[PDB]
Design an enzyme around this catalytic site. Structure first.
Site, PDB file in Angstrom:
ATOM      1  N   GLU A   1      -1.949  -1.014  -8.830  1.00 47.67           N
ATOM      2  CA  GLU A   1      -3.392  -0.808  -8.586  1.00 47.67           C
ATOM      3  C   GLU A   1      -3.969   0.819  -8.380  1.00 47.67           C
ATOM      4  O   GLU A   1      -3.248   1.212  -7.683  1.00 47.67           O
ATOM      5  CB  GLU A   1      -3.939  -1.646  -7.510  1.00 47.67           C
ATOM      6  CG  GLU A   1      -5.387  -1.920  -7.277  1.00 47.67           C
ATOM      7  CD  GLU A   1      -5.448  -2.930  -6.050  1.00 47.67           C
ATOM      8  OE1 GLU A   1      -4.621  -3.649  -6.008  1.00 47.67           O
ATOM      9  OE2 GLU A   1      -6.629  -2.622  -5.430  1.00 47.67           O
TER      10      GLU A   1
ATOM     11  N   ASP B   1      -9.229  -0.814  -9.479  1.00 48.88           N
ATOM     12  CA  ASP B   1      -9.933  -1.285  -8.284  1.00 48.88           C
ATOM     13  C   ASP B   1     -11.045  -0.353  -8.209  1.00 48.88           C
ATOM     14  O   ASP B   1     -12.299  -0.608  -8.791  1.00 48.88           O
ATOM     15  CB  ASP B   1      -9.185  -1.157  -7.087  1.00 48.88           C
ATOM     16  CG  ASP B   1      -9.916  -1.821  -6.022  1.00 48.88           C
ATOM     17  OD1 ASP B   1     -10.921  -2.178  -6.127  1.00 48.88           O
ATOM     18  OD2 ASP B   1      -9.040  -1.926  -5.050  1.00 48.88           O
TER      19      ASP B   1
ATOM     20  N   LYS C   1       0.923  -1.272  -0.161  1.00 48.17           N
ATOM     21  CA  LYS C   1      -0.067  -0.003  -0.006  1.00 48.17           C
ATOM     22  C   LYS C   1       0.924   1.255   0.069  1.00 48.17           C
ATOM     23  O   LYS C   1       1.832   1.445   0.659  1.00 48.17           O
ATOM     24  CB  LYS C   1      -0.901   0.046   1.136  1.00 48.17           C
ATOM     25  CG  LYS C   1      -2.110  -1.031   1.240  1.00 48.17           C
ATOM     26  CD  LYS C   1      -3.122  -0.518   0.122  1.00 48.17           C
ATOM     27  CE  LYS C   1      -4.267  -1.399   0.206  1.00 48.17           C
ATOM     28  NZ  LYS C   1      -5.467  -1.049  -0.684  1.00 48.17           N
TER      29      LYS C   1
ATOM     30  N   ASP D   1      -0.483  -0.771  -4.473  1.00 46.59           N
ATOM     31  CA  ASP D   1      -1.929  -0.233  -4.598  1.00 46.59           C
ATOM     32  C   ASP D   1      -1.962   1.136  -4.046  1.00 46.59           C
ATOM     33  O   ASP D   1      -1.389   1.538  -2.837  1.00 46.59           O
ATOM     34  CB  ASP D   1      -2.778  -1.026  -3.702  1.00 46.59           C
ATOM     35  CG  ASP D   1      -4.385  -0.616  -3.947  1.00 46.59           C
ATOM     36  OD1 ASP D   1      -4.458   0.428  -4.320  1.00 46.59           O
ATOM     37  OD2 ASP D   1      -5.086  -1.721  -3.519  1.00 46.59           O
TER      38      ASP D   1
ATOM     39  N   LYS E   1     -14.244  -7.315  -6.554  1.00 47.26           N
ATOM     40  CA  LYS E   1     -14.662  -7.739  -5.398  1.00 47.26           C
ATOM     41  C   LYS E   1     -16.233  -7.654  -5.088  1.00 47.26           C
ATOM     42  O   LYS E   1     -16.919  -6.973  -5.770  1.00 47.26           O
ATOM     43  CB  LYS E   1     -14.389  -6.410  -4.431  1.00 47.26           C
ATOM     44  CG  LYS E   1     -12.948  -6.041  -4.322  1.00 47.26           C
ATOM     45  CD  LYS E   1     -12.785  -4.794  -3.471  1.00 47.26           C
ATOM     46  CE  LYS E   1     -11.173  -4.574  -2.982  1.00 47.26           C
ATOM     47  NZ  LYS E   1     -10.799  -3.462  -2.205  1.00 47.26           N
TER      48      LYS E   1
HETATM   49 MG   LIG Z   1      -7.241  -1.418  -4.252  1.00 47.17          MG
END
Ligand SMILES: [Mg+2]
Ligand SMILES: [Mg+2]
Ligand SMILES: [Mg+2]
Ligand SMILES: [Mg+2]
Ligand SMILES: [Mg+2]
Lengths: 353, 354, 346, 353, 344
Positions: free
Chosen positions: D215, D240, D161, D189, D264
């Site tokens: 991402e 995403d 992240k 991401d 997701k």
């Molecule tokens: Mg993501």
């Protein structure tokens, strides 16, 4: 000025008659009513009236979000509308009703502190607004009947809900026009019921019935199709569901998708965002109409009225939510009386007690 | 509240340092200062800063237009900024300096009636703003000395004009950077000096000295070229002359022409239009800077400062005009004192008086 | 040749119908004694330019061009553009005077230096807005004078517009061409509606039906109606022309020296349009007089692609600010003559 | 088979440690657990784990919505997944968490009735999935040490992240790579933290650190900018937040906006919609990664795992939500154990309870 | 002023290293005579001297009685006669502008914009062994030339070699402009220019086939090196298309491609409006008259910032008196003589 505490409560007001649109029916106006108290004692009123059919928002989720917002803005100056929205946006990726609730209350407080009616702080172009009245989906016969009733009440513009079937939708409009004459303005709202191709067909079919504009004829996410309809008929096309916030408006104006955009504080998250939408549109030569959710009441409608009166480019108004309410949750503001003229008055802020 | 009368006067303030322009120079800041008086006695101050070489606006034309606007708005409410701009637009198709003068005085009046500092009516994000300071063009060594002096005063951002020839530009930037170190931000204004491909070359050469951004590297009307530059260099590119009003901003963000847009009240016709520009940019994910004219003073700077402080998306400020004035044309507002932090205070409106 | 001095004066001529034409008149004299005349006709409601601003700008231009050769029209415009970022009336005033001087030095009427296609041009005449009856009565009068093309403003309200057109068309017949100027009055879809309604009375063309900056809207109107659409306010300079022809926004483009800053820029606009297969018309401002109209007439007669002319300002003046040039007499044919340059003096 | 009753309850499970992303922090997995009982006795389990930072959904709003759906699907066949989604879409314009909760329970019931593991009904390509593990935003050296810890646990792919600053984010990655070596796969991401221009600059800066993919480098709404990044760097770019449902996927594949899409269940409203996304992507030569919300638990993760295992085109997995859970709300399904291999087993449906 | 007669004849000038054109003389009733020239390049426009002569004759008779100042009608007349004949049209056009200058008693450059009264031209280096032309390079530079034009596209390895030698021979103070003469595909052009860029290249002329505008636009967008169109732009319509699409950075105007000064002015103003500069070039078949006309136009117009007018340098004699001389020098000074400043 500094925010001392935020109070939130639920309000469930039954509608005098079920409201039927293409997306479904509305039976009650359930909204979250917010009160923002400052350390000096001034209190601002706001409201979050979610329409599950439009944004997916519910009263329960709106209440929880407002509480999260509330505990995050304690100590902030209501005039810092920039930071207030910043804080709310960092907390939730999407909750226009909850954001509008806090936002409207802050503007009410700004007006009270400045000791000026809200419309003066938002542009001051006018101190009143003329609204249409919406006629829910029903049989052509019945719709025309109610249309005559509304015209007798003083309404010169009627918003006709359609979206059950091209053939039936056209019949509804024909009956209404024949019953009221050509001196009355008729705007239609299909609520995403038609395909772009069928939209063009339907609109052309009414070419002789003098239709002012057609609201959201196709699916909200079918921008190419919406642009197609706008480019194929000389009838004014307005986006509603296709425009929630300023980013949506920017995309629509950049692509020349529609001719007019319907602004709703409950779609954009408040006056702060609504001003952005209107200015983006005005810059592109696109007029705006101020709308509402059937779920909001006096507070939301009064806020919308002040903004509409204040801004030159908000040339149309569809603020009829209070007309269907069985009761009012607060005193002052726009009345429950079904009338086209909404006069704001000189009381500070929203003028609600 | 209602406008009773609109008074306008010429203002001439000697500059500490002469400003060199194409085919000439500027030794004094000559602008139009307006005072809008309401029936109740409240008075608002505004300024129309000309700039013939940038906007075509002259002091004579600005004074004449302001007089026309003034008589047309008598009887209107200063809060009805919507109608006030409507009236001015019906009268003149183009007069940003004159429209800004009326606009600013109206906002000053709004603050005075509401009894609130202007920034509170424009967004309230902050009550102060940091400005850079422009270093006058001179020999490298002299500009370097000036740079150290300004840094001593607290400035963390310096602005200098380039496009005067790459060797000369580089020489100046080199001396300045060596004098103050790399913790000081350097903003360059290329003032429409280069063709697109020449711009890329010059900017990449200057980039070796750590440049925060480059302002308007090509002619204002060459949007295709401006976009080309932005897309070919890592350095942040800012539109200035290419953006006068909200319509220009919309075109710029639509085409993704630049990284940042520079607002100037005297280019857009006031705070009302400036808000539109910022909202359009913010929505597009583009930050804004606000600058000033070589010929504006305290009133114009103060109004711009309140707006910059109030709006989150106006993240940069180049409001240094008062620092180069020999004397103040009015009382209050942003002072003549050269300091980076412009604190606005709690005085209503612009906090300016005779 | 070298420019010796530049003079400018404010000029105020009373209009026959409402109140006056206020412009800046320029005289550029060379070291050898030749004097060229120019005019800057502001139009605050169109370009934003004022007489006071135009006068101040011209003075600055004057000082900067002393010593330059009038034939160096390239440098003259370069100098003016360096001085002012925007001042078409002021630039036009200098530009016209330089072209006048070029003609005098070459001892040729101006139209011969601008293309030489013709030595005369036919202009329409604008009818002042009034009651449909009064307008129809004046239309007959104008046609009696020889005018075959009449111009009228619209966009004041569909019903009022139609009433006037109906009255006029009925009184003069269908042999008379009628061009309308909508003065940016309508939204795109309202424009299509209004124009198609007016189209029943045989309309030659409709000028600027929408706001000048709404190019997408303008293109929409053009593509939706059969009536010829002309850009006016949407085209100030050559860069605007290039954008309009590039997007296929209109059918015709209206040139105005006071919008583009002179003959030098107007030539560019016309060449760009001609190359794109778009004809040009040349018009005038309500504030200009003899000099501006005369300069425009020479350019119009000289260029083949400038196929229409709306140069009727002198017909509305009570008197002339100078001697020579296009006269005050209301006649459709403007014959230039063999006088060198503009053939104007004071 | 017919739905007899729908049960819904709240679950609040604290996370072993706060999870920090560019958008904010997550401290607990609060989800709505749904149990759909059929007339014959079979019960299906589903979960709605809302991420307010992503969709704006809340537990309270998700609960109210599920109740609305529940009372609308009584009497329907769980196999009629087409009508079940039709009904839910007519009720709410947007509530993926609530829709996923009902959807997952229906698929669990389909599996139980068919007496087959869910992955067999969804494609049957495999019966296990290998997942990465995400490292929350922190100081470079701290992140690096955590990376070594995770590699020792058997993880061959780490999701990093970033999103606090180009210069800082670049430093984080460098430290991690040098600490774990080039035998470990690293995906980043940025959670919409960078501008298109800055994204390109940042990605090129790591052109020597072997980054598998990046991402969502830019804002969710900035599709033109996202396409720009994808077109300017040879590094694989994944969407995403820019892709919630099938309509979003269709737009992205049509415009060639990205190289890979993160699916997701809590963004798209369940397995039914997730299958659409994957097939649209697969048709365009775009692979998909199965992801999750930190607010989900065993139920949501197990559902996602069965789908990922079943579908060939879902080539990557980021299902690490159970690893941070203090406890498990139900028995069976994907374990709380932090391990890369998620083996599904032969138990019918989700294999839960 | 009225045209009395139009005389046309073939002209043959001996070159130094291995020029056939049509020379026209337009005589007015008054007695003034204007000089014009049509240099047809069969490999560029397909025009032949025979066809050019026949066409000029057709034009000549059709314009008898017309005023040379009516350049608008003269081109109208020619265009209605032939759909394509730039060499012939330029011949008549140039003579008319010469006559305009004589009648007005002014140098032609004064009537065309008057920005300057001289122009600096580059000089073309004949392709040969890397060391040979490199020697000629230092040689041409000694003559005062600060800009050298070189042909490329005969193989990247060969091109880079010749350029390298020249650079190390004359230094980086000399500007080098290359003409690829439509030799590369868009992709190969980018790679080639990419490689040559390291040696400081001012610009690259027509790197791809004339009609591959999409490909030409690609090259222009991929390299920071200035790209110029030559064969891709013949007339004003071509220029308009190129500027509308941002196909190139610079456009090379040739009177023998566009049909004269009248059209060349259109091209330059269209380009200038779009921020595109122009260079004026010449055909190998042109001589004194054509070069002089081009020099006056380039001097007069600010936007024509480059010049490649070296045709007279390879001639042993001149078909007329005056105008640009045969001397190989960078500076071309026009003087104060009326019109083209050319006589028998
Ligand atoms: Mg993501
Ligand atoms: Mg609607
Ligand atoms: Mg600047
Ligand atoms: Mg007009
Ligand atoms: Mg060539």
């Amino acid at each position: 000025m500094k925010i001392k505490q935020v109070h939130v409560r639920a309000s469930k007001i039954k509608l005098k008659e079920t409201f039927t649109i293409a997306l479904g029916t509305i039976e009650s106006a359930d909204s979250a009513i917010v009160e923002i108290e400052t350390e000096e004692g001034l209190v601002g009123y706001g409201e979050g009236g979610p329409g599950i059919f439009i944004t997916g928002e519910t009263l329960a989720g709106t209440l929880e979000t407002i509480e999260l917002f509330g505990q995050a803005i304690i100590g902030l100056n209501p005039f810092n509308i920039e930071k207030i929205h910043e804080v709310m946006d960092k907390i939730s990726a999407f909750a226009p009703a909850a954001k509008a609730a806090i936002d409207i209350a802050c503007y009410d407080l700004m007006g009270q502190k400045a000791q000026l009616p809200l419309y003066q702080l938002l542009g001051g172009y006018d101190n009143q607004v003329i609204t249409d009245i919406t006629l829910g989906i029903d049989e052509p016969n019945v719709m025309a009947q109610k249309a005559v009733e509304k015209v007798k009440l003083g309404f010169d513009t009627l918003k006709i809900k359609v979206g059950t079937g091209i053939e039936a939708d056209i019949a509804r409009v024909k009956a209404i026009r024949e019953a009221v004459g050509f001196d009355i303005k008729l705007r239609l709202d299909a609520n995403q019921a038609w395909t772009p191709k069928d939209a063009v067909k339907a609109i052309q079919a009414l070419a002789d019935y003098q239709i002012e504009l057609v609201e959201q004829p196709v699916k909200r996410r079918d921008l190419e199709g919406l642009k197609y309809v706008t480019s194929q008929v000389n009838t004014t096309i307005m986006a509603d569901e296709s425009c929630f916030d300023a980013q949506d408006a920017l995309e629509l104006v950049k692509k020349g998708t529609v001719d007019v955009i319907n602004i709703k504080l409950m779609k954009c998250g408040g006056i702060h965002e609504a001003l952005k939408i209107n200015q983006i549109c005005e810059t592109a030569g696109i007029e705006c109409m101020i709308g509402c959710m059937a779920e909001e009441t006096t507070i939301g409608i009064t806020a919308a009225a002040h903004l509409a009166a204040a801004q030159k480019n908000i040339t149309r108004a569809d603020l009829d939510a209070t007309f269907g309410l069985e009761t009012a949750p607060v005193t002052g503001g726009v009345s429950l009386e079904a009338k086209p003229l909404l006069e704001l008055g000189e009381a500070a802020g929203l003028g609600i007690s």
